[PDB]
Every structure is written in structure tokens, then in C-alpha cells.
Amino acid sequence: TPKFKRLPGHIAIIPDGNRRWALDRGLEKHEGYKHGIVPGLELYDICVKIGIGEVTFFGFTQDNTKRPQIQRKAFVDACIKSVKELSKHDAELLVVGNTNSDMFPKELLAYTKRTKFGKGKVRINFLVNYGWYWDLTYAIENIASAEIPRIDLLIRWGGRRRLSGMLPVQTVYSDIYVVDEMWPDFKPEHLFNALEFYQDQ
Amino acid sequence: PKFKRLPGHIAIIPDGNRRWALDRGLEKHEGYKHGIVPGLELYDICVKIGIGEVTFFGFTQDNTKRPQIQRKAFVDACIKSVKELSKHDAELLVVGNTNSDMFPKELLAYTKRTKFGKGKVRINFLVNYGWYWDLTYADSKKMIENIASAEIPRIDLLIRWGGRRRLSGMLPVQTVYSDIYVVDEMWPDFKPEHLFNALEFYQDQ
Numbered sequence A: 001t002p003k004f005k006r007l008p009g010h011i012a013i014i015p016d017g018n019r020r021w022a023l024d025r026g027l028e029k030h031e032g033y034k035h036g037i038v039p040g041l042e043l044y045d046i047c048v049k050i051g052i053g054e055v056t057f058f059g060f061t062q063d064n065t066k067r068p069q070i071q072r073k074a075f076v077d078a079c080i081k082s083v084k085e086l087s088k089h090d091a092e093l094l095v096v097g098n099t100n101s102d103m104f105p106k107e108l109l110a111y112t113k114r115t116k117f118g119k120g121k122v123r124i125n126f127l128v129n130y131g132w133y134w135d136l137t138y139a140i141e142n143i144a145s146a147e148i149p150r151i152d153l154l155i156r157w158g159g160r161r162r163l164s165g166m167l168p169v170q171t172v173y174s175d176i177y178v179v180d181e182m183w184p185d186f187k188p189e190h191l192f193n194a195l196e197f198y199q200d201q
Numbered sequence B: 001p002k003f004k005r006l007p008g009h010i011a012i013i014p015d016g017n018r019r020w021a022l023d024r025g026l027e028k029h030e031g032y033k034h035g036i037v038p039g040l041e042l043y044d045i046c047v048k049i050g051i052g053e054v055t056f057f058g059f060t061q062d063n064t065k066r067p068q069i070q071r072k073a074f075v076d077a078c079i080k081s082v083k084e085l086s087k088h089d090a091e092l093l094v095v096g097n098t099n100s101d102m103f104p105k106e107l108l109a110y111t112k113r114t115k116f117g118k119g120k121v122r123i124n125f126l127v128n129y130g131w132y133w134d135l136t137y138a139d140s141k142k143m144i145e146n147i148a149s150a151e152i153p154r155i156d157l158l159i160r161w162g163g164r165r166r167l168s169g170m171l172p173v174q175t176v177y178s179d180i181y182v183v184d185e186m187w188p189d190f191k192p193e194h195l196f197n198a199l200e201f202y203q204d205q
């Protein structure tokens, strides 16, 4: 770990590129999501080691649930597994999203109140059946995502330079770092590169 | 140059005027007058290539807290930019907090979209703008349809000069899906190739 002079208080993660990653390996589009679980756990372990206090993962949007059933079932399954795996570590977990929907996984309702697992060394938020319009209209201190603070640094995998409607209130001033590799090809150097960028701003 | 796909609506963040001035050995406030011609050049290129709508980030409410000599210069440059475009076929709209002593009175004529000449392109300017003012301006549908910037549509491509990779609270509703292109050069060092590069990037998305 570099001797950072500064870290972001709050990083947002956009774990994009799972379908492209799968197709490149000769898999079906829906098979990439299960390969995005261990990267999230590796990113959690780095954040705990270096002292990042809060991480928000973009799980899936309301628009994502319009995708074919086989893809929706796979990404929902992978999101559930991610939250459950992180609950075995020292994470204070919160899931934010539209629970008044058939598309919100019932397995994740338990985590819609921030829950401390183990030593609670990092706060981890997950956006699940999330939509920016749902978030803003829920209401500014009363937006649906009000428990999620301002983001310092947003890191997106899969090479697209856009927010895909992640938390428009919290991302107003965020520095944005884009990794061209797809999310399942996560490496520590992607996070370290983004943190060097952040402290150099 | 010829493009396969063009964005309907480009947003511009003309950042880096003070760094540009200090690099040229000038006083911090002297960069802003050198940001006007870059704006007119971009408009000219947009009219030529056929971009329908351009929104310029002029200045925020937070920017008004800068030293007076900087504020008078950047306000003056925004007014000059709007007046000049008024002479060249732009449909102009200025969005910002008019209920403030920091809203330039010379731009009150533009707070309802106005066609000049042939109205070849829709040009919007954010002046004395803040994201919080915008969203809170606002049933919950009638609210988001009634944000202060509601007459500014969704942005396809946002181009920012000065090398910072952030939105600085530009139009959070309209930038949710925008593709973002960052030019490392400061805004007064604008060249056509900066816009061409951003449009090659956009058509490849």
C-alpha cells in the first residue's frame, strides 16, 4: 500500500462490463455476473487494508430489470451472493433501492437498514433496483438515498465515461476514474491508479 | 470532418481560465476575456457540423464568492458571449438564480428562450447556477418537470476543458446518462480538434 497523503472518504464503484467479459470468454451474456462477485470482495479487502471508510456499489437499476429474464435472474443472484459474502466480513452493509417493486429481491430487504457485521471496519452501500428518478422524487435531505453521503471518487470499469444515473445528488462534485477493463478483470492496480489520481487532484 | 453519429445536445464546461492566465504570466482574472472567442469558434463549428443544442456552464453561485476582480471579469465575459451569439443566429436561453444580486441584470432579457437570426442552434448558458437551487426549484412528477433547468433537455455528450474529471454540479438531472469527454488543455487553449476528438469518442460509444 502506498503512503497515501490523502484518501477519499467515500468511493463509488460502477462494476460494468460483465456481459462483454462473458462474450469475450465464449460464455452466454448472463454468465458474467457470477465472475463479478470475487472482484467486489477483493476491492472490499483492499479498502479495509488501506483505510477507505465507505464504498457504494452500483448493483442494478430499474432499467436493468427490463433485460431478458435469464440475465435479470443471474445479476440479481450475483448481487444477493455479493451482499451475503460481505456480511461474513467486517462491513456495515446498507442496501438502497425501490422495495415497492416485484423486481426488488426479497433476500435483500433485511439489509435496507444499515447492519453492522463483525467489527464494521468499512461502510458498504449497494444500489439494488435503484433509479435516479425514484430516488429524487421519493423526497433534498429526504431523497431515497439520503443515508448515502457525498461521493469523493467514482471508479467505473468497462470503459464507459458516464454515471448511468448513479446517485445524481451524491456525484455532483465526484472525481471520475474510468478503467477500460471489464469488471470481472478487476485488479488492485485499477483501485491504486484511481487513488493516485484522486490525491493528485 | 464527417461523423457517423452526432449528439443532439452537447454540454461544455469551459474550465481552466485562471491556470491559463497564470501560465501566460497574466493576473488570475485576465484568462476570462480569452475564453470568449473559443465559445464563438465552438458555436461556429457546431452550426457547420449541425449540432442542435449546446449548453455552456457560465458560473456557479459558489464562484461568486471569488475575489471581486475575478467575478467582474467572468461575469463580463459571460455577458459578452451571450450578446455576441445574439448577433449570429442562436436561439438563446440563460438559466440561473435571478432572485440574487449576483444574477447579471444584462442577462434578464434571456431567461425565456429567444430566437435570434435563423436560430440555427439552441444555446443555453448557466449563470449564477447551483444544482441545489435547480432541483429544489421544483405531485413529484410536476416537481422534476419543474426543476429550474426544465427547459434544458437531456445532455448526450459533456465536454470539459482544464483536465478535471467531474461535473461541478452541472445539471444533475440532464447529465445522468451523458458520455463525458475531458480535454487536458485549459479552455482558452480551445482548438477545433478538441471538439472533433470528443465527437469521434461519442460516435464510438
Ligand code: DMA
Binding pocket: A015, A016, A017, A018, A019, A020, A021, A059, A060, A061, A064, A075, A158
Ligand atoms: C447489472 C449490470 C448492469 C451489470 C453491469 O454489466 P452489464 O450487464 O451492463 O454488462 P455490459 O456492460 O458488458 O453489457
Ligand code: DMA
Binding pocket: A014, A015, A016, A058, A059, A060, A061, A064, A160, A162, A163, A164, B177
Ligand atoms: C452495474 C451497473 C448498474 C452498471 C451500469 O449500468 P448499465 O450498463 O445499464 O448502464 P449504461 O447502459 O449507461 O452503460
Ligand code: DMA
Binding pocket: B014, B015, B016, B017, B018, B019, B020, B058, B059, B060, B063, B074, B162
Ligand atoms: C467562472 C469559472 C469558474 C471559470 C472556469 O475557470 P476557472 O476560473 O475555474 O479557472 P481555474 O480552473 O484555472 O481556476
Ligand code: DMA
Binding pocket: A173, B013, B014, B015, B057, B058, B059, B060, B063, B164, B166, B167, B168
Ligand atoms: C466554468 C465552470 C463553472 C467550471 C466549474 O467551476 P469550478 O472551477 O468552480 O469547479 P471545480 O472546483 O469543481 O473544479
Ligand SMILES: [Mg+2]
Binding pocket: A016, A017
Ligand atoms: Mg453495461
Ligand SMILES: [Mg+2]
Binding pocket: B015, B016
Ligand atoms: Mg476551475
